[PDB]
């Protein structure tokens with residue numbers, strides 16, 4: 001079974017760095033987020049894996065689900081928000097791509113202690 | 123020739139989505155039979171951007187033990203070319219096999235791009 005950490009990397013890491021309007025259409029397809037359904041909302045982080053994993057050593061904050069293993073990045077990070085358009089219809093999943101620089105909040109667990117869930121961008 | 127250009131020449135064929143003569147023609151036309159009959163070679167029938175994106179997908183160990191290999195999350199249309207038993211340089215003969223598989227490539231450089239085709243799974 002895919003680990004939670006591996007799932008986080010597949011769903012949310014794109015360290016190669018989004019300039020195009022079609023970025024989300026291609027990425028969402030390439031990360032298997034459109035196979036059975038259009039994942040409506042997703043965020044990709046364009047920092048190194050090492051910088052993102054380091055967030056697990058930064059600001060401890062509550063998770064939306066009430067657990068206490070969430071962490072906010074001290075710095076802002078280059079991210080892209082992908083949100084399915086109002087007219088998007090599976091299997092032709094269409095997304096709006098929005099670039100931003102925001103702090104991320106992830107849940108961390110395991111050994112190595114790394115992100116396993118994307119909680120929010122702030 | 124940069125390593126990235128060498129990877130495109132050796133392994134990219136996006137124009138195709140492959141006949142029984144496909145490998146015989148392609149192995150010759152991409153200079154993979156110039157010095158010797160290259161024994162095994164894979165061509166990928168995806169866009170360059172799609173193959174390049176693999177360098178940000180699933181990090182996996184390379185066959186040589188290096189750590190810079192990446193497996194595609196999605197399957198990709200590929201053709202494997204394998205030299206026949208009767209093939210004798212310089213008339214290199216190949217069996218052509220179409221498949222849809224995850225690919226594993228090694229990436230290097232800035233930009234971080236594919237420079238080696240490691241395997242299909």
Ligand SMILES: O=c1ccn([C@@H]2O[C@H](CO)[C@@H](O)[C@H]2O)c(=O)[nH]1
Nearest residue numbers: 132162163164238239240241242
């Ligand atoms: O499935 C495979 C296995 C190997 N090779 C080629 O054969 C070389 C040696 O294995 C590799 O660098 C690569 O160019 C392929 O093209 N496809």
